[PDB]
Scaffold this active site. Structure first.
Site, PDB file in Angstrom:
ATOM      1  N   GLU A  35       0.814  -1.237   0.100  1.00 59.60           N
ATOM      2  CA  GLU A  35       0.040  -0.099  -0.159  1.00 59.60           C
ATOM      3  C   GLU A  35       0.808   1.154   0.087  1.00 59.60           C
ATOM      4  O   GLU A  35       0.547   2.271  -0.805  1.00 59.60           O
ATOM      5  CB  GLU A  35      -0.736  -0.056   1.279  1.00 59.60           C
ATOM      6  CG  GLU A  35      -2.055  -0.921   1.315  1.00 59.60           C
ATOM      7  CD  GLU A  35      -3.054  -0.576   0.100  1.00 59.60           C
ATOM      8  OE1 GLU A  35      -3.024   0.547  -0.407  1.00 59.60           O
ATOM      9  OE2 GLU A  35      -4.066  -1.370  -0.003  1.00 59.60           O
ATOM     10  N   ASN A  46      -7.438   9.711  -5.468  1.00 66.86           N
ATOM     11  CA  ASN A  46      -8.406   8.577  -6.216  1.00 66.86           C
ATOM     12  C   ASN A  46      -9.040   9.338  -7.130  1.00 66.86           C
ATOM     13  O   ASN A  46      -9.216  10.523  -7.101  1.00 66.86           O
ATOM     14  CB  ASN A  46      -9.289   7.836  -5.144  1.00 66.86           C
ATOM     15  CG  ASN A  46      -8.426   7.123  -3.923  1.00 66.86           C
ATOM     16  OD1 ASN A  46      -8.814   7.429  -3.014  1.00 66.86           O
ATOM     17  ND2 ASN A  46      -7.516   5.979  -4.613  1.00 66.86           N
ATOM     18  N   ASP A  48     -12.482   9.526  -7.441  1.00 70.49           N
ATOM     19  CA  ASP A  48     -13.605  10.045  -7.017  1.00 70.49           C
ATOM     20  C   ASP A  48     -13.299  11.526  -6.164  1.00 70.49           C
ATOM     21  O   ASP A  48     -14.191  12.046  -5.568  1.00 70.49           O
ATOM     22  CB  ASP A  48     -14.297   9.120  -6.103  1.00 70.49           C
ATOM     23  CG  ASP A  48     -13.540   9.068  -4.642  1.00 70.49           C
ATOM     24  OD1 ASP A  48     -12.359   8.902  -4.796  1.00 70.49           O
ATOM     25  OD2 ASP A  48     -14.363   8.704  -3.744  1.00 70.49           O
ATOM     26  N   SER A  50     -11.480  11.480  -3.438  1.00 75.52           N
ATOM     27  CA  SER A  50     -10.747  11.439  -2.104  1.00 75.52           C
ATOM     28  C   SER A  50      -9.227  11.069  -2.307  1.00 75.52           C
ATOM     29  O   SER A  50      -8.838  10.950  -3.410  1.00 75.52           O
ATOM     30  CB  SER A  50     -11.509   9.922  -1.573  1.00 75.52           C
ATOM     31  OG  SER A  50     -11.237   8.915  -2.396  1.00 75.52           O
ATOM     32  N   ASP A  52      -6.034   8.634  -0.343  1.00 73.50           N
ATOM     33  CA  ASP A  52      -5.482   7.654   0.656  1.00 73.50           C
ATOM     34  C   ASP A  52      -4.462   8.170   1.419  1.00 73.50           C
ATOM     35  O   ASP A  52      -3.342   8.866   0.752  1.00 73.50           O
ATOM     36  CB  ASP A  52      -5.197   6.318  -0.039  1.00 73.50           C
ATOM     37  CG  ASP A  52      -6.262   5.658  -0.723  1.00 73.50           C
ATOM     38  OD1 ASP A  52      -7.641   6.039  -0.290  1.00 73.50           O
ATOM     39  OD2 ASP A  52      -6.244   4.928  -1.579  1.00 73.50           O
ATOM     40  N   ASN A  59      -8.695   5.832   3.355  1.00 76.52           N
ATOM     41  CA  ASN A  59      -9.231   6.606   2.546  1.00 76.52           C
ATOM     42  C   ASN A  59     -10.164   7.636   3.407  1.00 76.52           C
ATOM     43  O   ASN A  59     -10.809   7.689   4.231  1.00 76.52           O
ATOM     44  CB  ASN A  59     -10.030   5.731   1.532  1.00 76.52           C
ATOM     45  CG  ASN A  59     -10.560   6.540   0.345  1.00 76.52           C
ATOM     46  OD1 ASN A  59     -11.772   7.370   0.697  1.00 76.52           O
ATOM     47  ND2 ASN A  59     -10.165   6.651  -0.526  1.00 76.52           N
ATOM     48  N   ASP A 101     -15.205  -3.753  10.073  1.00 72.30           N
ATOM     49  CA  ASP A 101     -16.232  -3.094   9.538  1.00 72.30           C
ATOM     50  C   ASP A 101     -17.305  -4.274   8.861  1.00 72.30           C
ATOM     51  O   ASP A 101     -18.433  -3.993   8.448  1.00 72.30           O
ATOM     52  CB  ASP A 101     -15.811  -2.249   8.380  1.00 72.30           C
ATOM     53  CG  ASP A 101     -17.101  -1.272   8.023  1.00 72.30           C
ATOM     54  OD1 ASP A 101     -17.096  -0.525   6.791  1.00 72.30           O
ATOM     55  OD2 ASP A 101     -17.907  -0.973   8.801  1.00 72.30           O
TER      56      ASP A 101
END
Ligand code: CL
Ligand code: NA
EC number: 3.2.1.17
Length: 129
Positions: A35, A46, A48, A50, A52, A59, A101
């Site tokens: 990562e 990203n 969209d 957003s 990271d 995110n 989650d």
């Protein structure tokens, strides 16, 4: 800060990630390697809008606030900048929320595509833990 493989493994173990929610230490070190290449200052935007952040590329759409991701959530209740610290505490605590989650470590694309189903124990071999 750019962590060494074993240095990060020890840091994560100290913070309670070994076997957290059933994921052995090797899984977390493998996820961090792909990562962020063990770099706490890693950031990636990203499509969209957003971004990271950090060692585990958390995110801003759902976990931290960076002030530039409209209609996003801050589930870890922390500024995204806190995730870039040389001290991984913030990243670890937030990661614990994410992995609980419901989708486990599948939340991390690199883990799913490059760690899942592989011999992750190899990531902590030779380390004094
Ligand atoms: Cl799971
Ligand atoms: Na956010």
């Amino acid at each position: 800060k750019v962590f060494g493989r074993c240095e990060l493994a020890a840091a994560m173990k100290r913070h309670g990630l070994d076997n957290y929610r059933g994921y052995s230490l090797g899984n977390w070190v493998c996820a961090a390697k792909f990562e962020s290449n063990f770099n706490t200052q890693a950031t990636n935007r990203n499509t969209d809008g957003s971004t990271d952040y950090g060692i585990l590329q958390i995110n801003s759409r759902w976990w931290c606030n960076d002030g530039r991701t409209p209609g996003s959530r801050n589930l870890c209740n922390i500024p995204c900048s806190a995730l870039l610290s040389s001290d991984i505490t913030a990243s670890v605590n937030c990661a614990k929320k994410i992995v609980s989650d419901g989708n486990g470590m599948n939340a991390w694309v690199a883990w799913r595509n490059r760690c899942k189903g592989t011999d992750v124990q190899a990531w902590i071999r030779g380390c004094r833990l």
